[PDB]
Design a protein around this ligand. Sequence first.
Ligand code: HEC
Ligand code: HEC
Ligand code: HEC
Ligand code: HEC
Ligand code: CA
Ligand code: CA
Ligand code: CA
Ligand code: CA
Ligand code: CL
Ligand code: CL
Ligand code: ZN
Ligand code: ZN
Lengths: 768, 770
Amino acid sequence: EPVMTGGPVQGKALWTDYSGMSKEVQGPVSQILFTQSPRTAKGDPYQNYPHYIPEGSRIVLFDLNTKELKVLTNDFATAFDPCTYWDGKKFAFAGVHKKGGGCQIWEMNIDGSGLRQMTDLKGTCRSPIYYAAGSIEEGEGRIIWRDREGDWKEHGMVEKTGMIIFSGSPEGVMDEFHNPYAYNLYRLDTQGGKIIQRITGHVLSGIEFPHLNTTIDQITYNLSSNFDPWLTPDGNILFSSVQANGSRAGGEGRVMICVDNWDGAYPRPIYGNCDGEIGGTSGRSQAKITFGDRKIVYVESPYMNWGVGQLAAVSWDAPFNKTYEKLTGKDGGLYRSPYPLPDDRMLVSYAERGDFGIYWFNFSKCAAGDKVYDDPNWNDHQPAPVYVKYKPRWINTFTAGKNFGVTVVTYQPFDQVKVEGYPHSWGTWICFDTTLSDQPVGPYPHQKAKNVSHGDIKAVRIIQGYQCVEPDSTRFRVGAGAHLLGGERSSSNSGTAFQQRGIIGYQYVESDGSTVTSQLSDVPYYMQILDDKGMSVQTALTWAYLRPYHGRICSGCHYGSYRGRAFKNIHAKALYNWWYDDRSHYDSPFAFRYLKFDNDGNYKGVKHGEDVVGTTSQPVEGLTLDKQRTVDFRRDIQPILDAKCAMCHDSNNPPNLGGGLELVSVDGIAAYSRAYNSLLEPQRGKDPNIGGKYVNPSAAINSLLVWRLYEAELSANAPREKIFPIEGRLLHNKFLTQDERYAIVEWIDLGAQWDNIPGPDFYPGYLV
Amino acid sequence: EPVMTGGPVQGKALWTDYSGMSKEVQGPVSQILFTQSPRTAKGDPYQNYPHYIPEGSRIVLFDLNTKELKVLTNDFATAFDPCTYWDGKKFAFAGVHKKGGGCQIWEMNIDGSGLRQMTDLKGTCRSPIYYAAGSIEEGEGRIIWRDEGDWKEHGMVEKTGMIIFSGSPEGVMDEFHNPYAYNLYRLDTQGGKIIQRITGHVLSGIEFPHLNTTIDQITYNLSSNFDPWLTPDGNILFSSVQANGSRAGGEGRVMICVDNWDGAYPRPIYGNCDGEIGGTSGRSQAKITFGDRKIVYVESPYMNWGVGQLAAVSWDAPFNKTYEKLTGKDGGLYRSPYPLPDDRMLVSYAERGDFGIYWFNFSKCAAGDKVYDDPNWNDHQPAPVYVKYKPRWINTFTAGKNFGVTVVTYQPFDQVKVEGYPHSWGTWICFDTTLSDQPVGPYPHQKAKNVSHGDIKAVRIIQGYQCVEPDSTRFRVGAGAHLLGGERSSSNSGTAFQQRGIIGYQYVESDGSTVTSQLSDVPYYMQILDDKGMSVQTALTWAYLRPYHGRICSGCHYGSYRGRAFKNIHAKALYNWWYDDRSHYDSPFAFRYLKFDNDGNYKGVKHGEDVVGPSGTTSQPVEGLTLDKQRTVDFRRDIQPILDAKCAMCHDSNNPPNLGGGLELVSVDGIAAYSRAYNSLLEPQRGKDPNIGGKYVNPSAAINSLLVWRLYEAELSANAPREKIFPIEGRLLHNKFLTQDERYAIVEWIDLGAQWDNIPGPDFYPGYLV
Ligand code: HEC
Ligand code: HEC
Ligand code: HEC
Ligand code: HEC
Ligand SMILES: [Ca+2]
Ligand SMILES: [Ca+2]
Ligand SMILES: [Ca+2]
Ligand SMILES: [Ca+2]
Ligand SMILES: [Cl-]
Ligand SMILES: [Cl-]
Ligand SMILES: [Zn+2]
Ligand SMILES: [Zn+2]
């Protein structure tokens, strides 16, 4: 049947219509695959989602007719997350074998034979899916490349099995909630790099598994978990992303439904991350799309880390509030792992009182319909019916994986590091108007601290987030700053919800508000727009990432060009600063290490660092990771306070800046110094996520401390009712030089941390 | 051991310390009572909480040593909510007899004998508890009263106690349009003779002669009040649903609060205010620990759920700083916690979904060793047997319905049947109406502008009408889903505000103090008004006065009833309250109308037609006690004709808003409820929270409404409805189109919540019909 578009004949669908062709190619459903889990907190740890390793679980095949059940995973200690192939004769899953090796990705035929290990990783792997890239039809494709200046010739063939997109986490890392996992999406070459060689002309760059004949490449760099990938009708990857960055979303964060390319070139939000939307802090997981009405249907859990909950839906074509539905939707139990069929039916895992089973869903009654299978001794979930899957279109990839770009002219793969000689992979990004936003003027860091027009935004600060890695368990403590702004998300490293960060660099902004820059690739980052004093007016709280050689465009600053609105037609100066030279990949300037000011401390220009190192016409700066600058309170700030402040500020004259770097014990926890505790102290009647008495994290322009150091009213948000005292006033603007003052500014805009150097270091801190 | 205070001997507690005495008076526990429910949506309907009737459930007794189990309730088809007596030889519960009668309150001995029926109520009853009032030590007690007069003993009554339970009538809808509205009832077990012992007159209320019991309604909330329990100082701890109008993001909140056993002084404890933890989470089954004095309650993910995690806040200082999460790291579901004087606790727990009884572990922040878990039953509501210490009983100044008790001679009196008043009445006073912890903001529970003393001229007093729609062809839920109300709208209104009317207006003194006499035993709230007669701030909640009672507050949500001590204030209203010895109260009754000057500014207050056996027990004219004659603003009867006369001529489809078409219903998404003008005026605006307002209308703030802004042709508040308000080109002055009465009729309509059908039940005025 036609769905998205009309077909060749009445009642028939065009091959371009994914939904319709899926309807026509489905066929009768007889057998289904699903996961049976032990009923235990350890057997069904859905409270630890996305990190879900239902130890003791198995994958089973059930016949809807003969009612006979077969266990396919008997050789596995744990097995889960089944996903069938296109033909339905084989399927991929996640699990750990009895022989050991950890939780990995495997695939096996539907009859139970032909087992193969797709991943050997240090970490845990989950939820594999098949993405057919360069394989639409069954057979062998041909590999062709250029002679390096010769012609294009054929070399060899490859069986077309496509790729595998999965979610996985490394070993010994912490997310922004300090959970001991960080998940991200990986693309996997099933043929050992030769699929990517067929598509590109070079084998996949990434981590190679020659013993398994596979290769993996990390396509998503988010500092928190990205999980449960699926397929969009237009051939992209649909998944759930945790946006936890700093104090955003009331210091809670949100789990959003979003999509990205299979190489991770174009991540964009679908629903759930933006203010005014529905579900709040609810967890959103296991999202899939209906074929008939094209509905994104997902599990909405009451807790952000829960994998069980209700079922909700939003239109795929129009993911807005107007199309939001709560499917189930009341009485009285729990739902999980929904699976929409092309014939418009649906399979859900339902627990009426407390124990899950496979059930047909009923849309008329808004609840679970007739029963498929339930064992009382098992929790039955993740139904995966056996049928024929129509392959979504595969999108062209301009990256060969790690360090590897593919030119737009000759389409020839190139290594930016090993060959071209760059210290690190580097992409570019461009914003056509930095002043253009849908956000109002407000106290919160993601909003505007003041009205800004074209010319008011002088530059932008680009910041890289650092993963939280703490091998030594004696030198790190979570909740050390609970008395400070951070609360439960604070730690030995920071008294705020902001984890460790560093400055990628500064880039100037044109008089029309446009900006473009070259910077590091495959690293989590975000930006801040700056006024003529070099303070952040507005912060983008999220983790952006660039694949090698990839540019990224946006109309505005959270304007809707990547969310709900069409791109605005804009003729921008930055466009001509991007690529003008024949001999270059990109001619855009790299992020500068410093800024330079005038006498007053107003913005003058950008200043090169000493990190400067023929495929680009501009000085290459800021690609060396070991040289990347940050602002540490102990190394940078505290000495300034000891020199020019502590003398005049003691217990009698608050805030108390004295005592040097000596740690102070609060609630039996010694983490920070006196000055840090004083400056990070909360204020009555003020949201800690906004800031404290003297400090607003990731807004310096809103901070009382900065207000006093400049002795001016900097923003439209007053820190308190009485800022400057009437009598006894003393002007603080002459106490510091521009270097020290702007060092404090940078410290606050970075999130006002304590330890900005990842891992245990020599500088003072928590010890037990 | 001593807890709150010190004892006479080291290691022992004073008799004034409740939590201290309870540790000694408890005794060993060899047996427990608990409820077993079938595992089904209809067998354990916790999703419909508080309205919970676990059909097919039994109450059982279990010995912790001999491991024996016995079914006491076998005569009942449905039985639940166990509560043990003080000695532990008997208990009370909610049950459905196999012979019928509905779900009522019952009590029986621990052995299974002595079955007695407490409630015949037409409706549902559950969660009964014992409150010992005039009963501390076992025995009989005296009944004394006065006839020139003396105080004579008229004989005795068994001292047993009172029963506080939750109950709801039938054919009734709450603010969420659920088919139940619960409240709290006090019950005399001796047939009114215990109330006669305390007050000197039998309890007035609904009488149950054949059961020898009497009931009185102590809580008038339009939404459900449930799960009553005991405070260490002798009050009633329970859960309250505050849903009123668009309150709290339009979804309302479920708060833990306390009230006197006669319902004289309800006050919030935790969960109802901005900044507090838990949001829209349900808070139910709240109990208090003896050792560290912690309120421990079930925090449900969903507002209507009776299962969830376990949360706690200190009873002594119920604030965010004492808040903590007791559970949740195992992913299991908890319900029905029961703290012990031994600093132990019994919890109902389903790890992977079979609910059972478990000993709680505080060191693990989760459930401990198993007590009894049957795979075939949800095992919950554990109620261990032991001797319970009795909380203090507070003096009641009301004998129940229509009955007050004099503060001078302490003599019960009937305000209606005897004194000749149309309805029972009471008083309330605020010392400063301009005093608040709330900032200036767009939301109706905040200030629309800064107000000082003298800026607040008067106050509007509004009575909430319960939603009763027996005929299903005349009423539809979600008729206004395209409007501001959303799914909480109905055939009655396009907003979340249900039907209500005007109790009346009362002037405010120059210092911000106000006091008034008004109806009692009815739900109501107040609005402070500026010199144009518009609400600056609305109190969104449901307040109720017992007969002859009166209630004081320092300020307007200043925190005198929440987290702050009363501010010392010498108020002008204090001298307008009771100055005469021959009167109960000398304070003025709520006036029906207003008087304005030629400028439209507040001149004063005006008497209505309802003025009234009657006796000389008050100095002021009696106004607004007739429920029949209580005035409200209805859009069809009042506003629409004004719109047709003065408006619709220039407003058609080509000139928004479209006010034409008369009262003819407009079908929207297959539902025809309201007219064209109503649909137009209640239309939402892009980028604006509908909980605040729409294009032309902000419910329960007229001063924030663009329509009113234009009708007065001025900027009324500090919250602008939109960026472009007054056109610079082709503008037309709208201020002289209406008289003062019409314009202020619109103002009143908007301040009331901008309803459509304000007349409860099906009427002759145009509306939804199938
Ligand atoms: C080193 C550059 C610093 C910093 C960072 C601060 N001070 Fe001072 N200070 C002094 C006096 C007499 C006052 C009170 C009078 C007035 O505020 O004008 C202050 C006040 C502050 C504040 C404001 C605190 C508040 O209002 O709550 C802040 C944030 C602050 N200081 C920071 C005196 C001196 C002084 C001479 C004795 C010197 C040197 C400093 N201060 C240095 C610093
Ligand atoms: C013809 C003399 C009119 C009468 C009778 C009424 N209105 Fe009117 N209205 C009229 C015009 C020409 C305009 C254009 C805009 C302007 O401000 O002049 C309006 C506008 C309004 C508006 C503002 C709509 C908006 O800005 O979105 C409102 C709220 C409005 N009119 C309401 C209104 C009411 C309540 C009337 C009866 C008292 C009424 N109008 C009569 C012309 C005429
Ligand atoms: C001004 C700062 C910018 C600029 C220059 C860019 N973005 Fe966007 N961004 C911005 C804000 C205020 C937010 C939301 C912060 C919060 O706490 O909610 C975001 C967020 C994103 C996201 C997350 C999804 C979403 O919120 O819509 C993505 C994805 C994203 N930003 C991408 C993006 C792109 C492609 C840009 C072009 C270079 C870009 N940002 C620039 C503000 C700003
Ligand atoms: C100005 C209007 C008043 C006055 C004259 C009184 N109160 Fe209070 N009240 C008020 C607001 C704005 C709110 C919160 C509304 C909301 O959250 O949407 C309340 C709330 C209450 C409550 C509910 C519990 C709580 O919020 O603390 C109770 C109970 C209560 N108010 C009682 C009360 C009493 C005893 C008063 C003395 C006459 C009183 N109110 C006056 C604002 C106002
Ligand atoms: Ca099952
Ligand atoms: Ca460190
Ligand atoms: Ca059980
Ligand atoms: Ca009616
Ligand atoms: Cl944008
Ligand atoms: Cl108050
Ligand atoms: Zn957003
Ligand atoms: Zn409140």
